[PDB]
Amino acid sequence: APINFTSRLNRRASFGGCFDRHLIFSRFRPISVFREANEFTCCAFSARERFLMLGTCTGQLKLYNVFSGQEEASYNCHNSAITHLEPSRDGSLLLTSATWSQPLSALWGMKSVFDMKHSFTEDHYVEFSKHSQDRVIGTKGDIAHIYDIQTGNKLLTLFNPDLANNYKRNCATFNPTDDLVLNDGVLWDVRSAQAIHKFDKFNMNISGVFHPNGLEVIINTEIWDLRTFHLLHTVPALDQCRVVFNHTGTVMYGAMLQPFGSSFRTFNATDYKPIATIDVKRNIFDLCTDTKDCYLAVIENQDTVCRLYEVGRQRLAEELAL
Amino acid sequence: MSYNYVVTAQKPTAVNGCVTGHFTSAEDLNLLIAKNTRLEIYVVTAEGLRPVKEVGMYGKIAVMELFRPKGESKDLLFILTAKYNACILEYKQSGESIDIITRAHGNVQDRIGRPSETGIIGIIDPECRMIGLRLYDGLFKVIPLDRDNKELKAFNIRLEELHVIDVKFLYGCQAPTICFVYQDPQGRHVKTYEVSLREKEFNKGPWKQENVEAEASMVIAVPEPFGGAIIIGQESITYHNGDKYLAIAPPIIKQSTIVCHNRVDPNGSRYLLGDMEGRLFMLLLEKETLKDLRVELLGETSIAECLTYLDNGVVFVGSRLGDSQLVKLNVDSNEQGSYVVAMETFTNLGPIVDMCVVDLERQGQGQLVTCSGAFKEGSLRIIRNGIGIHEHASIDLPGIKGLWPLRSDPNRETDDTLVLSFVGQTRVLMLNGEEVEETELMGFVDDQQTFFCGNVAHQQLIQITSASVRLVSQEPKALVSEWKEPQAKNISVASCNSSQVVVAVGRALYYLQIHPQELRQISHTEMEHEVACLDITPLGDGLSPLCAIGLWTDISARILKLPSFELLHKEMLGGEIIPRSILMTTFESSHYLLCALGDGALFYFGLNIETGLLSDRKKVTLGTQPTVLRTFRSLSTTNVFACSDRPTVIYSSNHKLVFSNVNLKEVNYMCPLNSDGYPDSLALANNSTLTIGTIDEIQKLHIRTVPLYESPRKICYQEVSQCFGVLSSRIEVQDTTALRPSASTQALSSSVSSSKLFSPHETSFGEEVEVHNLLIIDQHTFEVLHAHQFLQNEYALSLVSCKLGKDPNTYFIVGTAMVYPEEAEPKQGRIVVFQYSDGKLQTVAEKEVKGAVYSMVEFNGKLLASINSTVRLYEWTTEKELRTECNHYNNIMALYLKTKGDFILVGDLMRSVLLLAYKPMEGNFEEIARDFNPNWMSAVEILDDDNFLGAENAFNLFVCQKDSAATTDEERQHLQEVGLFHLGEFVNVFCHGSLVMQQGSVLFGTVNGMIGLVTSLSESWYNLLLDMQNRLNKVIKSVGKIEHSFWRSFHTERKTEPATGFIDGDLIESFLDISRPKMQEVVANLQYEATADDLIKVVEELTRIH
């Protein structure tokens, strides 16, 4: 596994990927800028990724063509500022979440029949199930709510005050198998509706995220085994970071909090090894990746705007060899 | 709207894994070899290896283990493929029927997870309890082996150690115990675990985990009585069995890393070891118990991928980087010190890294020259399709209707006279050296057309004409006897032996014997229909008791006994077009019969000379003209030449007949010839000329190896100088000090680069460094004419031969890169211009660039090169220098470049392909369209102006289409992927052309040496062949019970879709080899309405383009 790309490439024809991913995912290139016609809060790509979906501080939802950069539509969704967006991989549904205008979250039928499908009044945050997007999970303080999509009615609530950590930024979410839930640092067996384990609280304001392998749990800086429960690794750089993986499952995007700092960074999801630490030199509010590892959308202000990045290309400064 | 056809030209050669065992029966010894998708089964003997069965699977073999469970009659095979299909195979053989039967199967792919980057590891415990698999990181998959697990259901076990190096099951433990090497940040370690089928978990290992060498890479389990585990690193070898520990660090190991191992003695007493650079070792475990570790060097072999000790000091060397070997080990050192001598050698084209298509012997017909091999196994490989002839004499003689060699001197053994039959008359020619001049001869008439003549017994000659049968003395040269039909009727069909003669007069057959001065009439018959053809070729020594005949009205081949004319066996033949040639010969001690028809069809049977029995009717097609068959011998082996519009030689390879082409335009008549001016030659006549020449070897593909002894990288052909340009690289050790004399140090004229453009890098002396060279090679003799060495740390990456701008001079153009190991991406490059003068090599021009020139290509008199992430376009000055004109910046690393007229197709590292254009009005580029999907490209080619092809590291192919009819400007630039197909090879080169003389044609070469063809089809042809392909999978049962649908399904780590746009040509061509009623089972009421014969018409025309 040589270091120099040209030597390593020659070995491919004759006879690894980490050094290649280290090269590509330390390189981010801004190409275009997405403004609004009359001088944002959230960002996400559509299902087939041909449009970009943006949330505003007035409760509106904007849609831009990634090819042209014009507004294709405009919608009013809430009376509070939008906080989070998540379309279904079907291309049929969308989830919204505002700050304080009840109902806080809602489920939406996409543009064909575009209309409100169900209401989620009590829940700030919302998130689809991972494998089969047939159920929906929402967060009310330290309480998790699991809902059905077609009926809109509630299936079960998950809370246990004897075991709570009372995290600030708590967000309950499913595992890739749809048979576990993590809330407030507590594993729940979805079927048996009981508690499995209560992780120790090492942070003030981070709940945790599952790893796609179904083997690990990512609390702030601690990787816990999902069955042994032993501490497997300590990743210091993830402190206060909201962690997103790419579609293939090889790379992590971490976002420093305190809504976010001036820099994000990328990690190698297999060995949790740092790749790079990119500094855009602006305050960051949201980010998301396409499933093609082509575009990176970032919201940031100088007046808030969404600047679009191309992956694998260099900035001019490093490209000028000073 | 895309329609394509993919077929295999050369099955892969490289060896990927090989195991030995008692598979066919508990008595004989088998050797199994696993090439990419094919496995080869052999029987080990004293003479060598005897092949028994050769089978293709729907998958590439990743694990291949033999095991005999309890109470089983003989060993069973276990195979896992790359797409995680498991199977257990048994060998059934009743008579001549050999079929591979499947006990159990099933897919063990996990629904979630990423495959380990280190790779798939497959092992089996001695107890035959379970199969252990490392498929994904952090897990350990187990397949129980109880007789009731007929579906191969697996379970996983959480393995906390993530980066596992190698795993083995141990011997002599009270419970199934494993031993593996894992890598922590605190170096790498060795640890043991037990396995429980009931609890489905792990339990404490028998001994404490321990530290090992930081480059420990291999784990070997020693059998009882010893037990324990040997672990091999780059510096030292250790022994591990609980309390015991032995460790030695022989200095010989440090030079090169150990790759493969093997047991010799079932006690574990003696093990073999191979390294990268060819060396072969012997490991010893000294008893009295497990006293010592000792290492001895044995010799040098081919770079070993796998090693199998067969028997009695005979070792098989499975090679992936060069030719595989069969090796004998002698205890007495040879003269030069070695213990190793090579018995046989097996061809390996892989790995192919580049190739070109050049018309060498026959203009219009292609051949490949491939850059093949590896470090010391580097070689050029010249590949010809079909057999050619080498002329020596050309005479204008139109109208020839027959040819017969003849030795006129009864004393000398060489032919000296060639007899030519024309329309209604005959002439004679003698051969004084090379002069060919008219000759007369007493006894022979020249006013009648000849049907046969030649030497007969008793020192005599015979001429058989339309009028009579004439027997001629030898020494006085006079007519001694003449035969005529009793009513003075004409002769219709003739056939003659050294002592026997059979002619025909309409329906009547006459049998004659040749005695001194006598034509002895023996028998007579009257036949049911007219006579068409005859043959009495004696299959033994020669007095043939058999006469083969085919008739007119009742079209049929009959065997008759001599002199009885008693019928023995009749075979009906379809159709109402008569046979026109029949023959009996002997291929490799098997007796066959050949019968050609008037449309260019050929039936061939088997023959029991004792009983005259024809068996296993088979049918082939040779062109359109009627076929003329005739026997010739070459290299003391008998073969058959078939004269038609597609001249063909018939021979036998491994007891099956094979039909190799003849690289000629058309041959009407043929005879062998051996004269004092034309030794062992052939005499050929079309209907306009008479040629004489010598023949090549009798093989479908002839492969000429040119060992270079260093690593080749690229190649291109400069016609205007009769030369090849080859880039290379050899490894030297920093004193730079070479390892062995290779081609770059043994050129006639050598040179070095005197550039000084690059006026901070430290080398630890002993480290390995590549040194690159430009090699120039003759077109005929392939000897290294000149070797230009490049600078230090400068790699040669791109090569083009062309003329640029208006300069009529033709050049060699090279693009390089400054490669320093501590740097991550090269920052310095160079583009050099050469011309090869009459004998010398002249440096013309340079051009400094800030990156690597991964690819460049001639673009309309302009040079079109790629630097690290830029696509640049140069012009060639009237002052003979380079002036950039354009750029293109939107890509990660521009690695692969191809050009149609003014279109540029660019392959990137992770974004698949770009389509660029050149606008003459603006002097810049315009990005036309792109493909967004993250495909890790490895090769690319332009098919036409609207379809584009490439292959990525996911073992796949795809085609992108430009929707020129654009509703919107966005839909315009989506390169829509309309072809998808899982191939199973790693393609490194595409080039246009075909290896067949006389739409579209693209050849590609892979890592396993596989050579494939990709041609286009039309909408009618696609929809039809796609129907056959579903219908064949209904019939052809795949080994392992794997669906063809699943195999060819396009599969990356991100997508998995069925295949569309391509057709599996290897599957379509297997339609011919299938049985007859199964064909009728395939053609059942398929409209598109043709059935069961019109398809054989199609597939045979498809097997024709390669």
Residue numbers in the entry:
A (entry chain B): 1046 to 1060, 1068 to 1091, 1096 to 1314, 1329 to 1372, 1381 to 1400
B (entry chain A): 1 to 288, 296 to 548, 551 to 744, 749 to 772, 777 to 1015, 1025 to 1114, 1123 to 1140
Verbatim from the authors:
The Vpx/Vpr family of lentiviral accessory proteins usurp the substrate receptor DCAF1 of host Cullin4-RING ligases (CRL4), a family of modular ubiquitin ligases involved in DNA replication, DNA repair and cell cycle regulation. CRL4DCAF1 specificity modulation by Vpx and Vpr from certain simian immunodeficiency viruses (SIV) leads to recruitment, poly-ubiquitylation and subsequent proteasomal degradation of the host restriction factor SAMHD1, resulting in enhanced virus replication in differentiated cells. To obtain structural information regarding Vprmus and its mode of binding to the CRL4 substrate receptor DCAF1, the X-ray crystal structures of a DDB1/DCAF1-CtD complex, and DDB1/DCAF1-CtD/T4L-Vprmus (residues 1–92) fusion protein ternary complex were determined.
Superposition of the apo-DDB1/DCAF1-CtD and Vprmus-bound crystal structures reveals conformational changes in DCAF1 upon Vprmus association. Binding of the N-terminal arm of Vprmus induces only a minor rearrangement of a loop in BP blade 2. By contrast, significant structural changes occur on the upper surface of the BP domain: polar and hydrophobic interactions of DCAF1 residues P1329, F1330, F1355, N1371, L1378, M1380 and T1382 with Vprmus side chains of T79, R83, R86 and E87 in Helix-3 result in the stabilisation of the sequence stretch that connect BP blades 6 and 7 (“C-terminal loop”).
